[PDB]
Amino acid sequence: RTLGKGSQPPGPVPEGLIRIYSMRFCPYSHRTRLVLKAKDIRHEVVNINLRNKPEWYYTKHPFGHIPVLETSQSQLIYESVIACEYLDDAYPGRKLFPYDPYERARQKMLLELFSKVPHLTKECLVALRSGRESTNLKAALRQEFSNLEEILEYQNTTFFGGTSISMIDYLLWPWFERLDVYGILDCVSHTPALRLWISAMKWDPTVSALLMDKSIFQGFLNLYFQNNPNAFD
């Protein structure tokens, strides 16, 4: 259950566990939850009410952002990209970043190329749910997706890092999962390799294990856009 204003601090993180502060429908914390699951890392999730944060939560992140990792040695790591990197370096089995220093750098370059998508998807959602104009937002999103489509087509690989799923794919995934519920799946209608990638991601055991419940997510968005505080409980 999500903690908010009035909730007591959780205790220290047990030895042999790492803690993630998250929220069930936040795509940034979804990144880091995929990495935790993909690496079979033993963890606990503490969900936070973003509209009505616990006052102690500002001791985990100064502006109360999520995600934050908290270790059994009381160390704090944030936000999502830095957390995912730490996890891959700190935990041994299944390495998600590639071995080649160049390929590692290329995945980080791809991540920069993706930097407008999160805000564009969110603005599209808000535009469609308020009845505001969305022609420009969708054209913009389609252009960002064409930039990704060119990479996949040029490489002739299913995934962004190659034939097998890797760190970059998990870093991009949360926003693609959301296209359906956001009502913007039409924004990949011009990008066939990207549509193949979505399907490949859905078949990934980690992705599949973390897929949101569509109906509950729609219910969250319905109360969120009515400005209801209960949306975050």
Q: From the list 85, 169, 177, 204, which residue makes contact with its own copies (rule: CB under 8 A)?
A: 85
Q: Of 15, 29, 10, 16, whose CA–CA distance to 173 is shortest?
A: 29
133 binds, among Cl ion, ligand GSH, its own copies, none (CB under 5 to 8 A by kind): none
- The 43-82 site mask, x for binding its own copies (CB under 8 A), equals ----------------------------x-x-x-xxx--x
26: annotated active-site residue: yes
Question: Is residue 185 within the footprint of Cl ion (CB under 5 A)?
Answer: no
* Contact between 199 and Cl ion per CB under 5 A: yes
198 scored as a contact of Cl ion (CB under 5 A): yes
108 near its own copies (CB under 8 A):
yes
In the bound complex, what is the minimum distance in angstroms from residue 185's beta carbon to Cl ion? Answer: 9
User: Interface residues with ligand GSH (CB under 6 A)?
Assistant: 26-28, 50, 64-66, 79-81
Q: Is 50 in the site for Cl ion (CB under 5 A)?
A: no
**Cα dihedral 128→133→135→138 (10° resolution):** -30
User: Is the Cβ of residue 109 or residue 209 nearer to its own copies in the bound state?
Assistant: 109
d(CA 187, CA 176): 10
Q: What is the CA radius of gyration of the chain?
A: 18
Residue 120 binding partner per list its own copies, ligand GSH, Cl ion, none, with a CB distance cut-off of 5 to 8 Å that depends on partner kind = none
What sign does the CA torsion over 112, 113, 119, 122 have? negative
Partner in contact with 157, chosen from its own copies, Cl ion, ligand GSH, none, beta carbon below 5 to 8 Å by kind: none
> Which amino acid is residue 55, in one-letter code?
E
CB 184 within 8 A of CB 138: yes
Binding site residues, its own copies, CB under 8 A: 71, 73, 75, 77-79, 82-83, 85-86, 89-90, 101-102, 104-106, 108-109, 112
Residues designated as active site: 26
